[PDB]
Amino acid sequence: SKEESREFMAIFPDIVRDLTDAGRHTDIPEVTKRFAKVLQYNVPTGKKTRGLSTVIAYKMLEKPENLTPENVRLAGILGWCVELLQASLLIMDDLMFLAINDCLHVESSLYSVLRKYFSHLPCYVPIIELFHDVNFKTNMGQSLDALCMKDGRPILSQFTMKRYSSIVKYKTSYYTFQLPVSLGMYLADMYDPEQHRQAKTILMEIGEFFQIQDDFLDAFGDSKVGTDIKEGKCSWLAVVALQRSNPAQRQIMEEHYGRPEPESTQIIKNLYIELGLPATFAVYEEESFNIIRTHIHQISKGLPHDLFFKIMKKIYK
Amino acid sequence: FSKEESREFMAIFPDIVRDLTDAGRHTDIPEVTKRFAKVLQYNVPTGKKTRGLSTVIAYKMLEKPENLTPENVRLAGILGWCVELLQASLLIMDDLMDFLAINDCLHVESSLYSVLRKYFSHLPCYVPIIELFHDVNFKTNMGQSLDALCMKDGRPILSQFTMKRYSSIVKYKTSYYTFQLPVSLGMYLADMYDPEQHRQAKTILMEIGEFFQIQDDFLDAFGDSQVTGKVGTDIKEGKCSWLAVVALQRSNPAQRQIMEEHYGRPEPESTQIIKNLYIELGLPATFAVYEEESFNIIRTHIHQISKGLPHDLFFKIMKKIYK
Ligand SMILES: [Mg+2]
Ligand SMILES: [Mg+2]
């Protein structure tokens, strides 16, 4: 809603003041002034889907009578901590020392925000541990992604659906889907590991569709102009292409996948069309939607079905 | 450090590797975990481990003798390895900025929080220790940013080379994680939470940290390469060195123009011109006076140490740096 978006965006200026203009580090004003610009440039622009998802999750997990402006604001601050992590990850991926240090500094700042607003609450240690664990798992995901590339060349023998599913889970789904919902759960004082486990099984399945759709639209979407083929990325399209390819089609992937020449991108796009990847994606979208929806209906305990259907409608519709 | 202290500390390392890579977790991604074990083994346990062993020595000299069990000294060792994980992440990053990727650097640092949760999450010192690592991380980042702001394009900004800025760089970039972190970890593991005690320690440790870096800066230009086993490149790299800061303080207009023209140039001739100016400006004699004056100030601050802190810990740390 407009009200949700506006109240969330209104928190950002207070976070910048907390990190750069709170009377700390008085001997190095040039660094804190510059850090405020780094935050202002890199963190609050474009869509804040992960941050707003944290507030939505909290609103639908908490007891209606506990949903106070103060508590919704705490959910918003957790949302901004997720956006500080998102900004650190985006900046690094765009860069790939002053630039690199800025990404580490943005990520490090979220723990200062957690200490200021949550150190006095029971959810403090669970939330800190969640951020630590998600950071470790994200690093493992980036490492698996990099093990699909040798020199500047994609290793197509590594492009298996099993490896693809693991990359998406660790590199993307944990911090994009699990982190917002688990933060909402902890702020609502839901600590039952079985509740977090059940949420995870669903959110990892939604996360996999989210990235497969992103991969499909990289090549077949209507105008950014997608560069997955050029960059030799382990994309769902490349994985399914290798499954469906005859030896002659496999040779085309080996020769042209991950080449910089615009003709090589066109050759791969044409092969994807020849292999019927658009039709294969259409079938996956319908079947995955139906399968996840069945799994949400089987969700027991005090987990609201409503939250997972809302997340689905955002991604699928 | 004693033979027993060193051997007991080194015995912990293979456990931390198994804890992080071979304890039944991340069952679906064995290629990544097997690789990460090699990243830890190849980068973390090699060389001197001064910061890690300093954490152990700090704990042993701060804790009540009756509480110094093998189990507690082993927890001090695990905290020391958490400092060495941080140190390995910073050293890998320095080497990449001059096989391993940037992501490995992030992964090695992230792993220390997994070790902290495993071994300390049950103790009252847990949140203080986590918050100390978070704060030292943020301050180290600020130090690295301040250091980077002394360079514009590929050239040093000599107007930025002030003693005030140099002192702030050494404090935030180096002294907090190298000197404060080991001692504050030792204090927290000994259930010493008094901010006055942490601040008393900090006053001394930041003074030791400043001499540590000033001596390192001096030896970069004036050290014996065959003795130190490294050829110094601070002049070529245009680093905000104590030598450069003091040179600019002592320089007449003609001497300053030599720094403007030749400081941070790749040509070996330019390194010799700057070294000759450092000799002309009496930087060796200035360093000798500083070493004597700083030793005496630090020795007195340690003699004066209060808040029930042990003077012998800080004398041991000082003695190691001044030799
Ligand atoms: Mg994409
Ligand atoms: Mg040096």
UniProtKB/TrEMBL annotation, chain A:
Binding positions (Mg(2+) 2): D93, D145
Binding site for Mg(2+) 3: D214
Superkingdom of source: Eukaryota
Binding sites annotated in the UniProt record for Mn(2+) 1: D93
Residue sites binding Mg(2+) 1 per the record: D93
Binding-site residues for Mn(2+) 3, renumbered to this chain: D214
GO biological process terms on file: farnesyl diphosphate biosynthetic process; pheromone biosynthetic process
Stretches of the chain forming a coiled coil according to its record: none
Keyword flag Cytoplasm: no
Binding positions for Mg(2+) 5 per the UniProt entry: D214, D218, D228
Assigned protein family: Belongs to the FPP/GGPP synthase family.
Name of the protein: Farnesyl pyrophosphate synthase
Annotated organism of origin: Phaedon cochleariae (Mustard beetle)
